[PDB]
Amino acid sequence: EWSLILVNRQNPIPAQYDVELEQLSNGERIDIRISPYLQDLFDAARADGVYPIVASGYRTTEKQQEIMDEKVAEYKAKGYTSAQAKAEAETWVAVPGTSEHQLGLAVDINADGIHSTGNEVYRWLDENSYRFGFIRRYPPDKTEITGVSNEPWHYRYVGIEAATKIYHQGLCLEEYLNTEK
Ligand SMILES: [Cu+2]
Numbered sequence: 001e002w003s004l005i006l007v008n009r010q011n012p013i014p015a016q017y018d019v020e021l022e023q024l025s026n027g028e029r030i031d032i033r034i035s036p037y038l039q040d041l042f043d044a045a046r047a048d049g050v051y052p053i054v055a056s057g058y059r060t061t062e063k064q065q066e067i068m069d070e071k072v073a074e075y076k077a078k079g080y081t082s083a084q085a086k087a088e089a090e091t092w093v094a095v096p097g098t099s100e101h102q103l104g105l106a107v108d109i110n111a112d113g114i115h116s117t118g119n120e121v122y123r124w125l126d127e128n129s130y131r132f133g134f135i136r137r138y139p140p141d142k143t144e145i146t147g148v149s150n151e152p153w154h155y156r157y158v159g160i161e162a163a164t165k166i167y168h169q170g171l172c173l174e175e176y177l178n179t180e181k
Contacts, residue, residue, distance in 0.1 A: 003033070003133070003159040005103065006177055009090070009147055012097045019104045021058055028057040031104030034133070034157040038107065041132035050124040051115040055153065056108040059101040068093040091149045100137065100156055107134075108153045122152035130167035133160045142172035 007013055021029040030038060038054075045052050059067070071093045075085035093099075100106035111121040126136055134157055140150040158166070158173065166176050 003105070003157060004162060004173075004177065004180075005105070006173065007098060007100050007103060008174070009094065009098050013102050017103070019058070021104055024054055024057065026054060028054045028107075029104065030054070030057040030107060031157070034105060037133045037157060037160075041129060041134060044128065044132070045121070045124055048124065049115070050121055051112040052109045052121045052125070053112050054107050055110040056101060057106070058104040059099060061096045061102065064094070064096040064099050064102060068095065091147070092151070094148075100154075105157045106137065107155055108151075109155055110153055118153075125155060126152070129155055130163040131160065133157050133163045135163050135166050135173065137173065139172065141170075142175075145172050145174050 020032045022032040022035045023029050042052060068089055071089040072082075072085045075088050076082065080088060094101075096102070101108075109121060109125060111118045125134075129135065134155040136152070137154050137156040138146050138148040138151040143149060156173065162176065165171075166173065169176075171179075
């Protein structure tokens, strides 16, 4: 139940959401409940010659705002008005209160650069993350349901049972939760 919490534009983070955070060696933080699962995922990738890093875990409200504002600025520089930019940025960065990053349940995983390319990490994760309870949260073929663009770096902990079902039936989290009730 706990790891199946739905957070998106229609489901904000609950008001007094408690989370205990573990600090990784790079200073990023995650929900302490997902720690051994993320550790196992990283160990397994490295046993396969794939070297990922956690580019972003937990974010405070203000951090989310800033990430979003930066995405808005990028669209403004490419010829969007302020209003247009804000709407387009939402397809990539959630408004504060609606990011999975604010749960500590989501990590953006990149390649280390030296040993692996992005695409080798993204491919490995797509094919293996579910065995560690993580799903590719925003897949290209579910944008019409999730509201979010293809983000091959963004992985969400839901637990092994749910992740495996979601993987084999080719679902997004919203669809899985709908079919659970
Ligand atoms: Cu993310």
